[PDB]
Amino acid sequence: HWGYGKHNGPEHWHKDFPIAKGERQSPVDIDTHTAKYDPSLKPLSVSYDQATSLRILNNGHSFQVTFDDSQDKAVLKGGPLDGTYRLLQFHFHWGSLDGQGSEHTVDKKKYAAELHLVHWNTKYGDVGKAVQQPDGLAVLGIFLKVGSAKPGLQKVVDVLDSIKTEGKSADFTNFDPRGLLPESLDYWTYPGSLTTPPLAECVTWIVLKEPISVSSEQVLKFRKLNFNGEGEPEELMVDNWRPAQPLKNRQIKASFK
Ligand SMILES: CC(C)NC[C@H](O)COc1ccc(S(N)(=O)=O)cc1
Ligand SMILES: CC(C)NC[C@H](O)COc1ccc(S(N)(=O)=O)cc1
Numbered sequence: 131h132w133g134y135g136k137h138n139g140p141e142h143w144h145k146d147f148p149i150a151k152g153e154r155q156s157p158v159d160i161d162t163h164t165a166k167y168d169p170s171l172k173p174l175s176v177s178y179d180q181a182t183s184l185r186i187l188n189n190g191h192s193f194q195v196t197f198d199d200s201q202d203k204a205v206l207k208g209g210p211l212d213g214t215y216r217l218l219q220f221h222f223h224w225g226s227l228d229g230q231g232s233e234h235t236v237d238k239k240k241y242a243a244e245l246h247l248v249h250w251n252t253k254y255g256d257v258g259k260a261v262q263q264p265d266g267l268a269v270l271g272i273f274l275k276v277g278s279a280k281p282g283l284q285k286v287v288d289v290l291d292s293i294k295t296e297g298k299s300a301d302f303t304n305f306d307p308r309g310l311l312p313e314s315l316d317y318w319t320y321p322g323s324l325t326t327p328p329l330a331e332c333v334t335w336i337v338l339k340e341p342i343s344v345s346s347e348q349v350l351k352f353r354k355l356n357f358n359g360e361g362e363p364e365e366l367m368v369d370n371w372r373p374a375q376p377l378k379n380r381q382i383k384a385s386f387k
């Protein structure tokens with residue numbers, strides 16, 4: 131099926147997911163001089179104090195940490211959003227080299243990686259219903275640059291050896307995702323899509339201006355994961371990012387001057 135290689139990557143996806151060429155696809159380049167400050171945008175409310183992590187999983191395209199979303203334990207509100215969005219999972223996209231790996235870009239600049247915290251609108255009852263709605267999901271995107279280590283990331287990095295190949299999972303309870311955020315919650319926002327198939331146009335994107343720093347040793351451990359399942363020819367999980375898509379009839383708004 132679909133992937134990130136030459137024969138199944140982003141340029142092929144439209145043949146099975148024709149919405150790949152749609153009117154509100156993600157990611158996009160964020161042109162900082164064209165984004166407009168919107169004084170009506172409220173501060174984001176990230177309420178992760180009661181988060182309950184469950185498992186960490188290599189899904190063949192990234193690794194993800196999943197959460198109990200059966201109650202309002204870890205929620206995102208405010209910002210551009212109406213109502214309450216529950217945290218379902220987080221995952222990353224990264225490169226083979228430090229100069230590439232992010233999905234969104236800022237004035238064409240690519241970061242080494244990008245963290246996505248995926249939330250769904252509780253008014254739709256479950257995530258499967260939410261992905262069929264134009265305001266069903268909210269993804270909080272955070273850029274990673276290489277510099278000093280991120281201490282809140284280390285517990286993730288230390289377990290990646292146990293989920294090297296596609297399909298492997300491990301217990302990952304008591305993880306606090308608040309340790310993955312930067313200091314500032316200043317953000318850009320625009321309406322978009324999932325960045326992997328099915329590419330559904332159901333996402334309010336919230337992309338933080340301030341990157342987090344991670345160490346070279348931390349990102350190197352991302353790059354030792356495998357796209358393949360156990361026993362298959364080893365293909366390193368690197369460059370699992372979709373490039374920027376046409377902005378079309380959309381305006382990116384900034385929460386800050
Ligand atoms: C070489 C064999 C094992 N791979 C199976 C077959 O080629 C699949 O080829 C493809 C290639 C692209 C896609 S899409 N439009 O989802 O990105 C789906 C199947
Ligand atoms: C039944 C539905 C919810 N399953 C959806 C599927 O797992 C894909 O989910 C996702 C979720 C988030 C993203 S991203 N890179 O835009 O944050 C991509 C795919």
Ligand SMILES: [Zn+2]
Pocket residue numbers: 221222223246325
């Ligand atoms: Zn993602």
